[PDB]
RNA sequence: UAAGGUGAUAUGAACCGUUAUAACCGGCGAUUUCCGAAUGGGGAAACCCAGUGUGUUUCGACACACUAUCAUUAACUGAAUCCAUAGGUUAAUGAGGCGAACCGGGGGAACUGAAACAUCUAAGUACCCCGAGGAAAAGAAAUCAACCGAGAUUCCCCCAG
RNA sequence: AGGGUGACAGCCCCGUACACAAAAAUGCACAUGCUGUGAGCUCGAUGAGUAGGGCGGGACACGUGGUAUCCUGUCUGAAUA
RNA sequence: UUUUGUAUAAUGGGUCAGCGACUUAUAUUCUGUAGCAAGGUUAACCGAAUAGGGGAGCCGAAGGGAAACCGAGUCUUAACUGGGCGUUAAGUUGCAGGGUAUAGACCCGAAACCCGGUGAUCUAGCCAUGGGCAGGUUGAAGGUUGGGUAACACUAACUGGAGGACCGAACCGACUAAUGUUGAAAAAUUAGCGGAUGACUUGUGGCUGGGGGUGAAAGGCCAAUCAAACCGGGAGAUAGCU
RNA sequence: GUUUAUUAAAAACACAGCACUGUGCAAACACGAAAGUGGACGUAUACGGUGUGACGCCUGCCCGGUGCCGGAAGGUUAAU
RNA sequence: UUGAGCCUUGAUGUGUAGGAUAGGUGGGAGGCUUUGAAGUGUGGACGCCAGUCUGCAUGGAGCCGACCUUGAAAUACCACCCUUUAAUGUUUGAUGUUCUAACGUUGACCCGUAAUCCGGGUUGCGGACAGUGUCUGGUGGGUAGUUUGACUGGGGCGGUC
RNA sequence: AGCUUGACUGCGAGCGUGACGGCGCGAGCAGGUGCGAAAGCAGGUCAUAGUGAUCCGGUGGUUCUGAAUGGAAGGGCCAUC
């Protein structure tokens, strides 16, 4: 018997594939409990059809959107002038909150949840880098010069 | 009577032959079993007296097509 | 068609008719008790007992019609259970039983013969059962043939004991 | 032809040969009206638990035999111009 | 008639009259006869239809060999002085007849086997529902009251009415004898005989069916039939026998 | 008590009683192609089969043969 | 829990000439080393206990091909492999426990239904068993069909053919 | 006692004997052989018993057949169980 699964089924299941099974197991258990359907031509073509297509669409859309995000702002530079004092050590330290909306005003619209901070609360006046996680593998690195006003 | 409801298998007749070829009448009987078939399109169990190759042909043709044949030839299920 | 008739044993009585509505012959109608598939329920066949509806200017009793089962179809209802199926009620259509042989199919002997008997024969005969028709069945090559060809089925004469 | 008539009838009677006859109901055959039904053309398809097999039995003139072929009770099982 | 042999006291027949047994079909062989003759003849069928067509076929003119094959020869065998079978003589189609074969096969006759039905109004068992058993004896258990015991046990009188109990009619049966035995009767009569409240008997209805029933068992009974009912059919079974 | 209706009424059959054996209930067993039914609306103190046949005293030895019951090691052993 | 097959891969295999617990074949003379060396402490795998292999490390950076006694060359490199074994993955069978989902239910309850049939529903129990079909061995006078010679101073018994 | 395989193969005039099936005797012809110098003798044993039809089938040989054709299977024929 050549049933097509519809479930996780214990020792043979992978949610819609082809298995060779005994007949008693098929008509007495699998078929009435949901769980399976026999491979009788048209259905196996049709069931496959949408499922195979599904895999192609989701992956491609995700990759493309993320590559596009990585590409965004062409200047790749966000500058900020925050209140400070004499020779370094600024008054109020910026965070990931401040920059998340600052980049919105000058390019990329990335939120607080996707910016990686190796510098922490960034308490230094100099050249800094905020590497974005536009995707799990794609990194969008925008250079930042912090000005001590 | 011992008729398969799918394939229509009556008991037929024959001979016990022996080593001395003595002909005796016998009956060959079908392998009739009373099995309860789930139909998904109706969401019910229709119980039939099938042969054990009426179950083969139900496994191949599907139960719906078979029930359409029984309803077609007036076999009541 | 008609000058004679009212069937026979079977005569009588009482009448009908003779130029056309006597009688006789034919076509189509009408009536067609009761039993019988018998069909409203029952039953020891030719009998017993009903229900429902319609009508009956003495409607305290009558008359008429319908009411079997099954199959198919439709409508209205309808459980365990919600939907639904089973079931129930009504209506429409059809069937049912008989018949001599022929026909197809499902079953299927034995005596007998073998100079015994068991394989074999008798014999797929007798018989039983189902079904159909005026015929049935079969039938339009997944058939033969044989390197040539034939062209569905059925029946008859050979082939050929 | 035949039958009857008081014995054996061509010409006595009924008939026979032959020639005609239907108000009505019908069977068959043409013609025709309506309804249903579908012609013809191009292209495509061209019958699966089936053929075949194992076991048991039956039908084929053919008794399992070296036994083709057909049918199938049981277990299986293709290729598909 | 059957026999070695029948007046035979072996079979058959009372007599008469009527009926009563070698047939029919289809094949094959031989004889007679008729036609044609190295040829004879058609079958189905068409049909002006016993004509005429129809020569499909069959038989004959060529055999030998298992067969290929050869052919007035052939087979055997490595081959035959040889040997086997042929050569050297007319057949064929009707009609009539004698045999033969297949059919009931000259006629009559079994016991029996099988198939389908009808029978439990008789009888056998069982089921249901109603009846029957005059009259007379015997006197169990129990009980009551006395006696008796520690209480029982036990014991006596009275009561009581058990029992496939006793005697005996109806009722059921059938042990003996005689009669009867072409009966009064296809199983009885007469005189005695057994049971007779029970495992009894009986009425009405029902149920069981043929290799089946039922059987307190005899192979008994199942409609005067029973080591396998009756009816109808296979069926004219078969009969080396009369 | 019963039996050969119609030549046998008996010592034969039956019997209470005894024993052996099967049977755990959808019982064994029987009729039935099957469904079902009887066993029994019973349940092992019950039911079926077989023998013996009130009661009394008793019922001895033999398991090699045939059967039955039990065993599973080995030999042989079908379809496949 | 138990066998085989296969893949990768690592081992495995002393007439005797002889430094060699070397099977064949075969292209080839550099492999080899600091992606941290020979030799050794030591345990284990292996054992015809002859002598391989080898985790870590003191040590510390070299070891060796044609050469040579051989039927053969040096698993120093490699390829294809026979025997024998080691680990993994994988491919299937076997057995036992456990499970619920087929089937059985002559358990209980509900419904068709004013019904100890039947069917359907809920649930309990049993459950791949039982049961039935085809095939097959055994048993099988429970039943059926039959056979059971002739001669013979009647037949049987004896004898004979 | 020496040497040997005639305990040959194909045939067979003619006879005997049986109802038949069958059985028996056989000079001679051909091929090849043994013994003998040779004439010759040898197709089992001094003779008469020592046996079993047909069917079915087994083994060896032989294209004789071989259901389209080439083979083969099966059959035939010869030997034989």
Curated annotation (Swiss-Prot), chain A:
GO cellular component: cytoplasm; cytosol; cytosolic large ribosomal subunit
N6-succinyllysine: residues carrying this PTM: 71, 83, 112
Keywords: Acetylation, Ribonucleoprotein, Ribosomal protein, RNA-binding, rRNA-binding
Positions carrying N6-acetyllysine: 89
InterPro entries xref list: Ribosomal_bL9, Ribosomal_bL9/RNase_H1_N, Ribosomal_bL9_bac/chp, Ribosomal_bL9_C, Ribosomal_bL9_C_sf, Ribosomal_bL9_N, Ribosomal_bL9_N_sf
Molecular function as annotated in GO: large ribosomal subunit rRNA binding; structural constituent of ribosome
Family under the similarity heading: Belongs to the bacterial ribosomal protein bL9 family.
The protein's assembly and partners: Part of the 50S ribosomal subunit. In stalled/collided disomes (pairs of ribosomes where the leading ribosome is stalled and a second ribosome has collided with it) bL9 in the collided ribosome contacts bS6 and uL2, while it contacts only helices of the 16S rRNA in the stalled ribosome; the inter-ribosome bridge thus formed is different from that formed between normally translating ribosomes.
HAMAP family (alphabetical): Ribosomal_bL9
Function in brief: One of the primary rRNA binding proteins, it binds very close to the 3' end of the 23S rRNA.
The name this protein goes by in its record: Large ribosomal subunit protein bL9
Protein source organism: Escherichia coli (strain K12)
From Swiss-Prot, chain B:
Keyword Ribosomal protein (UniProt): yes
rRNA-binding as UniProt keyword: yes
UniProt record, GO biological process: cytoplasmic translation; ribosomal large subunit assembly
A Pfam family hit: Ribosomal_L28
A GO molecular-function annotation: structural constituent of ribosome
InterPro entries linked: Ribosomal_bL28, Ribosomal_bL28/bL31-like_sf, Ribosomal_bL28_bact-type, Ribosomal_bL28_sf
Keyword annotations: Ribonucleoprotein, Ribosomal protein, RNA-binding, rRNA-binding
Any single GO CC term annotated in Swiss-Prot or TrEMBL for this entry: cytoplasm
Recorded superkingdom: Bacteria
Self-association state and partner proteins as the record states: Part of the 50S ribosomal subunit.
Family from the record: Belongs to the bacterial ribosomal protein bL28 family.
Protein name from the UniProt record: Large ribosomal subunit protein bL28
Taxonomic source organism: Escherichia coli (strain K12)
Gene: rpmB
């Amino acid at each position: 018997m050549q049933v097509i699964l519809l479930d996780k089924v214990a020792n043979l299941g992978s949610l819609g594939d082809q298995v060779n099974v005994k007949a008693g197991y098929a008509r007495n258990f699998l078929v009435p409990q949901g769980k399976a359907v026999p491979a009788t031509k048209k259905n196996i073509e049709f069931f496959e059809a949408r499922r195979a297509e599904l895999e192609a669409k989701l992956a491609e859309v995700l990759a493309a959107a993320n590559a596009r995000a990585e590409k965004i702002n062409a200047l790749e530079t966000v500058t900020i002038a925050s209140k400070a004092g004499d020779e370094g050590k600024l008054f109020g330290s910026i965070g990931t909150r401040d920059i998340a909306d600052a980049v919105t005003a000058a390019g990329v619209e990335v939120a607080k949840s996707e910016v990686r901070l190796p510098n922490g609360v960034l308490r230094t006046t100099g050249e800094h880098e905020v590497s974005f996680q536009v995707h799990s593998e794609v990194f969008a690195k925008v250079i930042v010069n912090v000005v001590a006003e | 009577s011992r008729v398969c409801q799918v394939t229509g298998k009556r008991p037929v007749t024959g001979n016990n032959r022996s080593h001395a070829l003595n002909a005796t009448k016998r009956r060959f009987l079908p392998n009739l079993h009373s099995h309860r078939f789930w139909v998904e399109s109706e969401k019910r169990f229709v119980t039939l007296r099938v042969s054990a190759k009426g179950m083969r042909v139900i496994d191949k043709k599907g139960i719906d097509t078979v029930l359409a044949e029984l309803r077609a030839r007036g076999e009541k299920y």
